[PDB]
């Protein structure tokens, strides 16, 4: 496929460029540290906050349509399904609430720094902290939405066969939803010690 | 060195544009998927046509969230502004756009199924509406974060 | 750093061209899908062709949105201009352009399905028009954002 050809082309040119700079004695030109040390920390922080809710919403939306389409299909000959199985949608939607909540907390950190302190130790720490803290919450919520959704669709299909089965399968959705809390807890921990931009 | 470099407006301009672009793609997909569903089922059941357009108007709603954020962000653009104001309104653009995009896809997929099922199990309609609205808010949660960030965009900024 | 570097017009030219390019791809796809549907069904029912042609007209309008934004941007190009004007009218170009592409895909699919089905269920035609209007305004939202940005491109600018 054509996209794989692009990947190998990009890999090869990167290797050649690195080897070229190395042999000519300019290996220190490609200085990842100075890039990381000199870009504005407002980029990392705002990019983290955006992707946090953004990816969380993608997870919830993906979970809902996995569950909803099967629930509607199962309901055609068993309309009793529609009202009791709503809980599976609830477990998907709450994953978006956690994304919103973290956005509330992090937004308070976005004070504006004076120019003399822009790239100081404390401000840089907050910039990196918010970025990765946002990613873990967003990525964990994205994964969580899929797992709950796939289980929710499975529950609706099973419930239509015998009402006694739903209660037993529902247990698996609880285990799936816990991944939302753990993502939230780690997000708050790694961000909790950072200070607002001084 | 300086807080207000010449390229700072770039993030504002692309933030303003991406807010409507991604939201528009989401609403288009939501309209397309459900639209075929309506046309498919109404051939035999024309009487319930106007009951079944709900997924289309709900998809239409998402586009309006993109518009208002784009308008609210746009009024903040200026030639001289800090990187602080640049990135914070890029975050507003990304968050609403990426949220509305996801909400549009979900409304399309579940609305397609709901419209077909509703044609032969009439109790199933209320089930559809309940699920769709929980998809709609996924756009709204994007709007709220965009509003929060935008409320802060020019507060106390030195430049 | 200069407010008005020599490469500033570049983003203007890209914005000017991008406005009409993407909008034409949207209108082209909407015309193609609708055209196949019309030709496929009107063989048996030729009497209703001039009623079923509306989706082609609806897709055709989207190209006009791109044209006017492209022309309005074009007449603001100059050799010496602030970089801020370049980014703003790049954003004006993208917002209408890729909104037109999104609306084009929507009109193409529901236009085909609606025409295909309407030929054996006369009550469905009003439904097709009603859905197409929701698809149409997705382009209009892009135009409104583009014109707002464009109006802001040259006021209170120093160079």
């Amino acid at each position: 496929s054509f996209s794989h050809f692009l990947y190998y082309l990009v890999l090869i040119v990167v290797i050649v460029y690195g080897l070229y700079k190395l042999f000519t004695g300019h290996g220190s030109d490609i200085n990842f540290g100075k890039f990381l040390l000199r870009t504005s920390p407002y980029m990392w922080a705002n990019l983290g906050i955006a992707l946090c809710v953004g990816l969380s919403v993608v997870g919830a939306a993906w979970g809902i349509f996995i569950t909803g389409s099967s629930m509607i299909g199962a309901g055609v000959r068993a309309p009793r399904i529609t009202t009791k199985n709503l809980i599976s949608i609830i477990f998907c939607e709450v994953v978006a609430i956690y994304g919103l909540i973290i956005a509330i907390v992090f937004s308070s950190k976005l004070t504006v720094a004076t120019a003399e302190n822009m790239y100081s130790k404390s401000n840089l720490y907050t910039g990196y902290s918010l970025f990765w803290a946002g990613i873990t919450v967003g990525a964990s919520n994205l994964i969580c939405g899929i797992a709950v959704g796939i289980t929710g669709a499975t529950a609706a299909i099973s419930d239509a066969a015998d009402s006694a089965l739903f209660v037993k399968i529902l247990v698996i959705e609880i285990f799936g939803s816990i991944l939302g809390l753990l993502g939230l807890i780690v997000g708050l921990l790694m961000a909790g010690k950072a200070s607002e931009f001084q | 060195t300086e807080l207000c470099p010449v390229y700072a407006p770039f993030f504002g301009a692309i933030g303003c544009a991406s807010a409507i672009i991604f939201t528009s793609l989401g609403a288009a997909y939501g309209t397309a998927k459900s639209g075929v569903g309506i046309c498919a089922t109404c051939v035999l059941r024309p009487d319930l046509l106007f009951k079944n357009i709900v997924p289309v108007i709900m998809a239409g709603i998402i586009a309006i969230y993109g518009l208002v954020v784009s308008v609210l962000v746009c009024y903040s653009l200026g030639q001289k502004q800090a990187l602080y104001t640049g990135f914070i309104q890029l975050g507003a653009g990304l968050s609403v756009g990426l949220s509305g995009l996801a909400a549009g896809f979900a409304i399309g997929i579940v609305g397609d199924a709901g419209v077909r099922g509703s044609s032969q199990q009439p109790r199933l309609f209320v089930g559809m509406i309940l699920i769709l609205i929980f998809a709609e808010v996924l756009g709204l949660y994007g709007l709220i974060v965009a509003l929060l960030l935008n409320s802060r965009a020019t507060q106390d900024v030195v430049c | 750093t200069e407010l008005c570097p020599v490469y500033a017009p570049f983003f203007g030219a890209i914005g000017c061209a991008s406005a009409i390019i993407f909008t034409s791809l949207g209108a082209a796809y909407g015309t193609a899908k609708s055209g196949v549907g019309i030709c496929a069904t009107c063989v048996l029912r030729p009497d209703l062709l001039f009623k079923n042609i509306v989706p082609v007209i609806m897709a055709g309008i989207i190209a006009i949105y791109g044209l006017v934004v492209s022309v309005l941007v074009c007449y603001s190009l100059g050799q010496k201009q602030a970089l801020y004007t370049g980014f703003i009218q790049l954003g004006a170009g993208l917002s209408v352009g890729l909104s037109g592409l999104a609306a084009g895909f929507a009109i193409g699919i529901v236009g085909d399905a609606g025409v295909r089905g309407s030929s054996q269920q006369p009550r469905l035609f009003v439904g097709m028009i009603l859905i197409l209007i929701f698809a149409e305004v997705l382009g209009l939202y892009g135009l409104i954002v583009a014109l707002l940005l464009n109006s802001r491109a040259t006021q209170d600018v120093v160079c």
């Epitope: - | 807080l3 800090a82 030195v158 430049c159 | 120093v158």
Partner: nanobody, 115 residues
Framework: QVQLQESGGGLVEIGGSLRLSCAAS????????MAWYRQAPGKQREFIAT???????NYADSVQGRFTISRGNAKNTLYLQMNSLKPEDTAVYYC???????????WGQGTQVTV
Amino acid sequence: QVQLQESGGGLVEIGGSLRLSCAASGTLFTFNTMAWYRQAPGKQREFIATITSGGNTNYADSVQGRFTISRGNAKNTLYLQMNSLKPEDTAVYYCNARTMTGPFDYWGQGTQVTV
């Protein structure tokens, strides 16, 4: 468009105290630097005082300990106060507001004071 206005000018008794007030409008950001200048007839403009957004103050030697400059509660508002005045202080006085880089450097219309 940005604009500025002085106020508080006019004639005053010898040795009297006086205050000048200034404001700037039409921009969303706080100005990095704001300052006062003066001009007597037959002379070029003379520096008087300046204050940063962080509240740091600097003065001309001639008015050291006689004049005081401060910012107001709200953004982009400025004050000058002189505890006593003498004939060599008579002039028109101007506000100035500046940006850390670029051509964005604004000046007011000015107001007169005499003994």
